[PDB]
Amino acid sequence: MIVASILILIVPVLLSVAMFTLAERTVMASMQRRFGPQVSGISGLLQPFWDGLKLGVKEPVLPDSSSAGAFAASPMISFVLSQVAWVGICISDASFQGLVIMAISSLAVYGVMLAGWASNSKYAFLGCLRSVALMVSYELSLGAALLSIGLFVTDGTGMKCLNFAEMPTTPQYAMLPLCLIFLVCILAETKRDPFDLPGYNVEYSSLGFALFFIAEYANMAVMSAIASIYFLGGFSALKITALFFAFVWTRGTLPRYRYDQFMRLGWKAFLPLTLAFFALHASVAI
Amino acid sequence: GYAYARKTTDKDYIASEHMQAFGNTQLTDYIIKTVPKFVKMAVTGPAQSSVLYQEPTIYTTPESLVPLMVFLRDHTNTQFKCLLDVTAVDFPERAARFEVVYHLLSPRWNNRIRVKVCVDEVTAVPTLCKVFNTANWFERETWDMFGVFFSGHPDLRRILTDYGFTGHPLRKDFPMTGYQEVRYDYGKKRVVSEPLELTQEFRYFDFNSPWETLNR
């Protein structure tokens, strides 16, 4: 029954990832006064499936100067971690569920760094360290935000936890600036605009590349569900769609930062703000 | 560094009467009288700045090109601060077949001037890199295209042609299509240079009238 529940979870995750990448193309097109994919299937509804099948019959490039095992292992590790994080969202009852998902998302750094070590490109090694530095820098603000969230999460028996079923079903109006910081931290983790300067998958083709992008979009959906649980009073389909629309909307209208600019932002703005909010919420919670 | 924005109103005028009269009429005689050893020949002709005026052309030796250009940059009446280009023209009938040409612009008094040096293939021309910073790439291009050596240049190397390219393409005796051509070889797995072959050779049309009077 656990294997059945996990496969029944896995099916809409992949279907949703295909529909997310189509919806990103089409919403980005509608903001730019065009159409986006319409030809490939009726209303363009077959475009992600033909992208996946095109990459399926695409030639796998295995460079004969790299280490083949780590090269194969990097997108597998990314994909596996995304699927495991989704299972932790929906098929768990653990006491420290948010800490579990934070631990899983801290493991997601390895696919980037294994891709940087494996492929023998000069600037893949240069960009992997930058991407890892960005993700590493914003993980701390995510953790301090979780500290602020957990100060008010108590179940019926009186025990404090990070269990998702014990979270309240009303929006957390008291933590609006922390919610905004959380959303920009999600944007920084997924390497989206305005942090998309670093790429690391420059040597990958066919289904290894497809695994990289499925992992990226599934991680975006994980973080969207986490933000909707923590701040928006629950996990729902409408909230997932609205937050995804917001992320595409921000990608349509903004330019990106330099490397040192978002490093200064994450180490001089977001971390002191989350720590100061934690101290204020701890003072309130007494 | 001149022509700073000073008037906040719309200006309906170009230059002043006295300085424009001096630049358009007296500048050739002025340059000849003040620095006579620098000037060997002068032409006053149809005016780079506008169709309505006349402007001078100064011929000088290579031994005095740098002091003449420093004088033309820094003298209070001739403030030629901008060097627009350096180029060459090939005259194969002459003993010295090359004319190196320098164009200058004066933002202070809305003027322009042209400076020429005549050399052959084996006489070096002093560089103007210390006088004008744009002289670097233009001298590199002139060496690339014509084979004029500029002594004292920091790094005189070719800038425009192919990596192994010997030969100076803008000479009159260099062929238009060249000597070598390029293709991919499946056996050597490399892009390879081969002697030139043309599927259709270039057709030269000799149009020139035997009554025409203007040919010089």
Binding site: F152, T154, G156, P168, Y173, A174, L176, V284 | -
Partner: protein, 67 residues
């Protein structure tokens, strides 16, 4: 030769040849905008934010006592 092209039957002078070209309308075109044309006070924004956050903190206190 130009009389063969633009001239009309019974034309007396070469100065009477018609001209019909692309022209602005009589009076010209109307004028257009050329230059650039262009929020709430920060006190108002901070007041609304403080009101929302104060309501949130009151609800947090109430749910804490119920728990």
């Amino acid at each position: 030769t130009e009389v063969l092209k633009r001239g009309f039957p019974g034309m007396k002078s070469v100065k009477d040849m018609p001209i019909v070209q692309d022209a602005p309308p009589p009076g010209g075109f109307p004028t257009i905008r050329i230059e650039r044309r262009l929020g709430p006070t920060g006190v108002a924004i901070f007041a609304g934010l403080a009101a929302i956050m104060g309501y949130g903190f009151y609800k947090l206190h109430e749910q804490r006592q119920e728990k």
